Ligand binder design. Structure first.
Ligand SMILES: Cc1cc2nc3c(=O)[nH]c(=O)nc-3n(C[C@H](O)[C@H](O)[C@H](O)COP(=O)(O)O)c2cc1C
Ligand SMILES: Cc1cc2nc3c(=O)[nH]c(=O)nc-3n(C[C@H](O)[C@H](O)[C@H](O)COP(=O)(O)O)c2cc1C
Lengths: 350, 350
């Protein structure tokens, strides 16, 4: 942890996970101010909006923070497949007096397909830039490192970690099956090894090269200590920060995570088009069930789901929301983010 | 921290997992003599054979050991379903010039359906009796405890752990998704939460009452230390002991676990009829695929598979073997069991 904190310029080996739709400049700044590494996610925003968000964080903290971008294979539009998916969803929209959207859009541009993102990052120079779903080309990773920036990439397997090493990243974020949100699997069509945090962190620390940031299921200082025993250099925690008042989780999401539903999470591909973990609801169904048409590509599926979420929310219905949560959800606490960071550090010290 | 060792009268908080077909009286005795808790599995044997196995262990050690029994819901014979399954397997049998069996047998009697097991255990009184796939009724757990036996039950979720506490067991074995072999899910028809070790151990230790024995993915002292930081009172390790000379793993299994195949494990229900983790081969296929008929009950499916294994083996083919292994398989070591136990203790102490 001394090595990692020195590398990142921070006091504590704790990253508050970037969480699209949940992390905020206020949350990131609170964690960075408290001594960890706060994070924001800027995928889905135009580069100049991402720039504004980065500048917002800087107006709230002097300390290092992490800017996260999705690096998936660029989605492949398929109007016919998307049409059939929308037709399939039509009765759900109709419950709320709505029709499905007339077309789906590539709402989350990959780092690999939006050439305006890299130069913006090279200008703003956040302390850390992180990638999910894949690693950028080595030359782009090097460009970021050429200015101040530390580069992290998420991996879910030793094979993916090898690719992160090849990309020249400064650290690998080892995401275990416990983790909330969309899984960082590079090529899900090849399957999902679905490796638990305890095995994955040990495997990458033992037979790997880079500092390992443990992600998935860690909710308290005991979990941080366990990750460190396995050989991690730091932890990345998402679910633990969702209930912070600084996050942009809405009231229904906070209520869900605080209550009995927190007892069980599940994986779904039907929410976004990519395997993701959260509190199961009506958007969690079997994609291989009879009558269910072929799934469109990521992220077009999520565009469809967001339209349905909008229609449901317009009638006060939250049963289609994306309430992401890891397998430690039952251990969630509701605290100001700075207090949570401090509490984690006290628990880590023992 | 001495919570489990004092409970069992042993020196080290390390259980060598019971492993049907792999653990032996010699393996159990080596581990118990070295200061841990050695284990044998006696399901699939008549009670008097089970008794003989227990006496074999006692012939080799005076120290505490663990005797394990399956406690699944008893399988229901279904000739039509079984005939359909055998028909589906028929071309595999034919590949090796064999016929499938005419009938499938209930080869592994549950503790719940063989009334001769409890009286035998009450007479022999091993230090620990453990159960997998379910908890016995409270009155039977009490009967065992009444003569000084410590009762352990495996759970894969907090809900199953609650049933273990209701049954009045002395300890819960928290089996995470990392674990090798058959998963201890009580009611797999309800689905499988598939909780990773790091989350599961923390959940049971943070929110439950019983001492927690961490099982799944633990291969070295760092892993043991990690489990203790999560709040476990001991660990249970299967895969780590498979390569010990004292085990009854055959040569193909040992070579498989030592070789490149150890880099990947997966789950299959088509081998035994219950979800199980091992090194994938031809018995690892999607049971929900088009053209695949309904699975017979556990353990009838395993009877079918064993017949196929026999036929394949006769032609020198090992691609249908049950080579169980957890997600830490790449970290397996080959040592005399007593030497492995000493190494683990050295690593644990730091
Ligand atoms: C609500 C939510 C949103 C998330 N959003 C992102 C994201 O936008 N980008 C990313 O790389 N990871 C995201 N993650 C995953 C985290 O980076 C991390 O893998 C995960 O939170 C660790 O598991 P935990 O929730 O048990 O701490 C998200 C996780 C959650 C729960
Ligand atoms: C080959 C093998 C056989 C096993 N047999 C049994 C068994 O007969 N009864 C039981 O309760 N658990 C059995 N287990 C599971 C262990 O009790 C334990 O949950 C598991 O080994 C822990 O995961 P690990 O292999 O990563 O250490 C077996 C595991 C393996 C790998």
């Amino acid at each position: 942890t001394d090595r990692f904190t020195r590398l990142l310029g921070i006091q504590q080996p704790i990253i508050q996970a970037p969480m699209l739709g949940v992390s905020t400049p206020a949350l990131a700044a609170a964690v960075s101010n408290a001594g960890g590494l706060g994070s924001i996610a800027i995928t889905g925003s135009a580069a100049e909006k991402g720039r504004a968000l980065i500048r917002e964080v800087r107006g709230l903290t002097d300390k290092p923070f992490n800017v996260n971008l999705f690096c998936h294979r660029p989605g492949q539009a398929d109007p016919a497949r998307e049409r059939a998916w929308l037709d399939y969803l039509k009765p759900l929209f109709a419950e709320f007096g709505a029709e499905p959207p007339v077309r789906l859009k590539n709402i989350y541009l990959s780092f690999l397909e939006d050439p305006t993102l890299l130069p913006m990052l090279l200008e703003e120079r956040p302390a850390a830039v992180s990638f999910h779903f894949g690693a950028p080309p080595r030359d782009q990773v090097r460009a970021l490192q050429a200015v101040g920036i530390r580069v992290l990439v998420c991996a879910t397997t030793p094979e993916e970690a090898a690719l992160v090493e090849a990309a020249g990243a400064d650290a690998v974020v080892a995401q275990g099956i416990e983790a909330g949100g969309c899984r960082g699997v590079f090529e899900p069509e090849r399957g999902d090894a679905a490796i638990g945090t305890l095995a994955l962190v040990r495997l990458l620390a033992a037979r790997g090269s880079l500092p390992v940031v443990a992600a998935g299921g860690i909710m308290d200082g005991r979990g941080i200590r366990a990750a460190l025993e396995l050989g991690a250099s730091a932890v990345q925690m998402g679910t633990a920060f969702v209930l912070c008042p600084e996050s942009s989780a809405n009231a229904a999401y906070r209520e869900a995570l605080k209550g009995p539903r927190a007892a069980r999470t599940a994986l779904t591909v039907t929410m976004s088009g990519r395997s993701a973990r959260g509190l199961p609801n009506r958007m969690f169904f079997d994609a291989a069930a009879p009558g269910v048409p072929p799934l469109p590509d990521y992220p077009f599926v999520y565009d469809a789901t967001k339209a349905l979420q909008t229609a449901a929310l317009a009638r006060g219905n939250h049963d289609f929301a994306a309430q992401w949560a890891g397998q430690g959800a039952a251990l969630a606490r509701e605290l100001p983010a700075a207090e949570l960071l401090r509490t984690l550090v006290e628990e880590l010290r023992g």
